[PDB]
Homo-oligomer: A and B are copies of this chain.
């Protein structure tokens, strides 16, 4: 995959399972267009969002639906979702892993960017 998402739960020390993820790409008129979506697996990973053909240069937004995740666990969290906004493939195709570490009042996000 050129774009992969990995989500961990810092309260349980486990992958964050069944987290909804929505990806958007900024259009020429400066609006967010839907690009791809999915849910994390039992390993907290989401693959197969896109192909290298479709994943062109652009500004992307990866929205990780954290409030929904915590609420299904009976926790009322602070954030609505985590939003990761970045320019992709500006110097040629790259492989991107977006990692997120979730707590109820806190999250972290890291990008690991590799040249295929």
Q: Is the interface of A mostly helix, strand, loop or mixed?
A: strand
Residues of A participating in the B interface, judged by any CB pair closer than 8 Å: 8-15, 59, 75, 78-81, 83-87, 99, 101, 103-114
B-side contacts of A107, CB under 8 Å: 108-109
In-complex Cβ contact of A112 among B15, B110, B112 (8 A): B15
B-side contacts of A112, CB under 8 Å: 8, 13-15, 105
B113 and A106 form a contact (CB under 8 A): no
A113 and B10 form a contact (CB under 8 A): no
Which residue from chain B places its CB closest to the CB of A60 in the assembled complex?
Answer: B80
Complex: A33 Cα to B111 Cα, angstroms: 29
B-side contacts of A87, CB under 8 Å: 80
B10 and A114 form a contact (CB under 8 A): no
B-side contacts of A15, CB under 8 Å: 112, 114
A78 and B111 form a contact (CB under 8 A): yes
A12 and B79 form a contact (CB under 8 A): no
